[PDB]
């Protein structure tokens, strides 16, 4: 994707990482970086530092594949909506005046599921299209950008955290197995519904999270942050607690 | 029995509402 491509983006970090970026360029009224959204799928946000204090946007990705900050006029790209603020405010706190460019050799930040992507895009194809070679190759690149919404959506059945549909108890039994890391955890399927739990290992007891879809389709703990997706969850409470009683720290593999 | 977060989500973002 092209916001790769930006000096000013600095891929999947977090707020306070976006923070800490924004004080060490001087926290100067109009500075900004973007990042990658965490929780809105395709989206982005906007850091901006204003008053000495940080201002955080959403871009999210509409589903004719624009680009909007709630309220705002869409735009064919974070690029474009970046340089539209630095001549219009048009609601937003300030100006943007000056990008805060990723230190040179600093690359954009990759999650778990960014550095697995393209294998789940290319096992997908292999699986459902039974190509080999040059064929294959195509059919991946045909189909790749038609893929990426499938794969982001299905893509948390692939990954080590995730256990489908087991009950509590064989989730404990799973958990409570080898070390007794903090932080130990998995995810299982509730209803096949769109409601999962979080397993949780905290000084030698197993906790459960209930997470469930809204009517949106966003998955969270009851109060909690808001995901599109099971893996962005994980990203999450692997960065910051949040209410949790620990962060996410091992994946509990699959026995 | 579930456990609850120990904290209500309490950033905001920004919108040009």
Redesign the interface.
């Known amino acids: 994707d092209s916001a790769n491509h930006l000096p000013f983006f600095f891929g999947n970090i977090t707020?306070e990482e976006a923070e800490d970026y924004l004080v060490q360029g001087g926290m100067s009224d109009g500075l900004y970086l973007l990042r990658q959204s965490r929780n809105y799928l395709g989206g982005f946000?906007l850091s901006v530092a204003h008053g000495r204090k940080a201002?955080?946007?959403?871009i999210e990705r509409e589903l004719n594949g624009t680009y909007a900050?709630?309220?705002?006029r869409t735009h064919a790209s974070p690029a474009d909506l970046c340089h539209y603020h630095s001549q219009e405010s048009?609601?937003?706190?300030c100006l943007l005046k000056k990008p805060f460019n990723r230190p040179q050799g600093v690359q954009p930040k990759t999650g778990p599921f960014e550095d697995l992507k393209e294998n789940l895009i290319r096992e997908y194809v292999k699986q459902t299209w039974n190509l080999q070679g040059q064929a294959l190759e195509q059919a991946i690149i045909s189909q790749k950008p038609q893929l990426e919404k499938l794969i982001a959506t299905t893509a948390h059945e692939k990954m080590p955290w995730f256990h489908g549909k087991i009950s509590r108890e064989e989730s404990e039994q799973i958990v409570l197995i080898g070390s007794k890391t903090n932080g130990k955890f998995l995810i299982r399927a509730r209803d096949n519904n769109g409601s999962y739990?979080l397993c949780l290992l905290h000084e030698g007891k197993v906790?459960?999270?209930?997470i469930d879809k809204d009517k949106t389709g966003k998955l969270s703990?009851?109060?909690?942050?808001k995901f599109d997706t099971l893996w962005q969850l994980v990203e999450h409470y692997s960065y910051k607690a949040?209410?949790?009683?620990r962060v996410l720290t091992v994946p509990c593999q699959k026995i | 029995?579930?456990?609850?977060?120990?904290?209500?989500?309490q950033?905001?973002?920004?919108?040009?509402?």
């Open positions: 707020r946000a201002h955080h946007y959403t900050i709630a309220g705002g048009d609601g937003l706190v739990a906790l459960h999270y209930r703990i009851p109060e909690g942050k949040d209410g949790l009683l | 029995v579930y456990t609850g977060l120990s904290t209500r989500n950033e905001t973002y920004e919108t040009l509402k």
